[PDB]
Amino acid sequence: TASHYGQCGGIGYSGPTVCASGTTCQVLNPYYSQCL
Ligand SMILES: *[C@H]1O[C@H](CO)[C@@H](O)[C@H](O)[C@@H]1O
């Protein structure tokens, strides 16, 4: 799962896009999306 304050789903990020319970993937920039 994506981590809190970690990148959740940006362009190029092939990692876990689904956040952990209690956190939400929020796109801050097109390439940087942070799980808050
Ligand atoms: C927070 O941790 C997760 C794995 O638990 C990463 O995928 C994420 O990019 C960030 O390092």
From Swiss-Prot:
<feature type="domain" description="CBM1">
    <location>
        <begin position="1"/>
        <end position="36"/>
    </location>
</feature>
<feature type="disulfide bond">
    <location>
        <begin position="8"/>
        <end position="25"/>
    </location>
</feature>
<feature type="glycosylation site" description="O-linked (Man) serine">
    <location>
        <position position="14"/>
    </location>
</feature>
<protein>
    <recommendedName>
        <fullName>Exoglucanase 1</fullName>
    </recommendedName>
</protein>
<comment type="similarity">
    <text>Belongs to the glycosyl hydrolase 7 (cellulase C) family.</text>
</comment>
<comment type="function">
    <text>Exocellobiohydrolases (CBH) that catalyzes the hydrolysis of 1,4-beta-D-glucosidic bonds in cellulose to release the disaccharide cellobiose. The degradation of cellulose involves an interplay between different cellulolytic enzymes. Hydrolysis starts with endoglucanases (EGs), which cut internal beta-1,4-glucosidic bonds in cellulose to reduce the polymerization degree of the substrate and create new chain ends for exocellobiohydrolases (CBHs). The CBHs release the disaccharide cellobiose from the non-reducing end of the cellulose polymer chain.</text>
</comment>
<feature type="glycosylation site" description="O-linked (Man) threonine">
    <location>
        <position position="1"/>
    </location>
</feature>
<feature type="glycosylation site" description="O-linked (Man) serine">
    <location>
        <position position="3"/>
    </location>
</feature>
<feature type="disulfide bond">
    <location>
        <begin position="19"/>
        <end position="35"/>
    </location>
</feature>
